[PDB]
Amino acid sequence: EVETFAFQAEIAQLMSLIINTFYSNKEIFLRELISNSSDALDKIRYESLTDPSKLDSGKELHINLIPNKQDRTLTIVDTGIGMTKADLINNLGTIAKSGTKAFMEALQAGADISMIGQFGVGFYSAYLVAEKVTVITKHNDDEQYAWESSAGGSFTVRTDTGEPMGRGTKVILHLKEDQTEYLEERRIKEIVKKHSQFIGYPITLFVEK
Numbered sequence: 730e731v732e733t734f735a736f737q738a739e740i741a742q743l744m745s746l747i748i749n750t751f752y753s754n755k756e757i758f759l760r761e762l763i764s765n766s767s768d769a770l771d772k773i774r775y776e777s778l779t780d781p782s783k784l785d786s787g788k789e790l791h792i793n794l795i796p797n798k799q800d801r802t803l804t805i806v807d808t809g810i811g812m813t814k815a816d817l818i819n820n821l822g823t824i825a826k827s828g829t830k831a832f833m834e835a836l837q838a839g840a841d842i843s844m845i846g847q848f849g850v851g852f853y854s855a856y857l858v859a860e861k862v863t864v865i866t867k868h869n870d871d872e873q874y875a876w877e878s879s880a881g882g883s884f885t886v887r888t889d890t891g892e893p894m895g896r897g898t899k900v901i902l903h904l905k906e907d908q909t910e911y912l913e914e915r916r917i918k919e920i921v922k923k924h925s926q927f928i929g930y931p932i933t934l935f936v937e938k
């Protein structure tokens with residue numbers, strides 16, 4: 730049921746760099762993950778123009794931010810295109826291999842961690858604030874999967890037995906003890922306004938009861 734895979738050498742190096750470098754501007758993780766969600770939403774919206782049946786799994790195109798102080802988790806939910814088993818294991822990793830190499834060469838040449846998005850590897854900025862990242866995803870062409878990594882050179886992929894999503898992605902960030910500010914309502918609002926104010930989809934903050 731659970732398959733373990735090694736990250737491509739370049740990816741493992743980037744992950745180690747993101748976790749061990751002293752960089753206080755950690756807030757950029759939220760705009761990077763919102764940008765991945767925005768790209769997934771663009772993809773399904775565009776594909777639905779030629780094939781409207783691609784929206785049978787859900788017409789709503791949105792982003793939900795769900796902080797949870799008790800579990801110390803920040804969940805980002807999108808109703809985008811989602812990811813297939815091949816996207817999670819092979820496809821996005823192949824694209825990330827070339828981008829990571831270019832970003833690490835740029836960091837050595839003077840560039841800062843905030844430029845991560847230009848190299849298409851912005852997803853990995855999640856490790857600036859999270860000790861573990863869980864990706865629950867559902868694409869129209871495949872089953873629902875759970876991708877997970879606490880870094881250390883490996884990741885796991887399994888078929889998701891939990892609640893069916895219809896279509897899209899859930900990014901669950903198991904936050905580091907010193908990064909609980911990203912669970913506060915006013916802090917999330919400030920990050921969204923500063924970095925993601927022009928995203929072409931509704932971004933809804935789920936306020937804790």
Ligand SMILES: Cc1cn(-c2cc3c(c(C4CCCC4)c2)C(=O)NCC3)c2c1C(=O)CC(C)(C)C2
Pocket residue numbers: 762765766768769772807809810811812816817818821822824825849850852864876898900
């Ligand atoms: C590069 C890269 C990009 N993303 C990534 C992450 C997400 C999404 C996307 C979409 C798919 C189509 C357009 C962009 C990509 C998405 O749909 N929603 C938010 C999370 C990943 C990588 C990896 O290397 C590891 C990973 C676990 C496969 C996640």
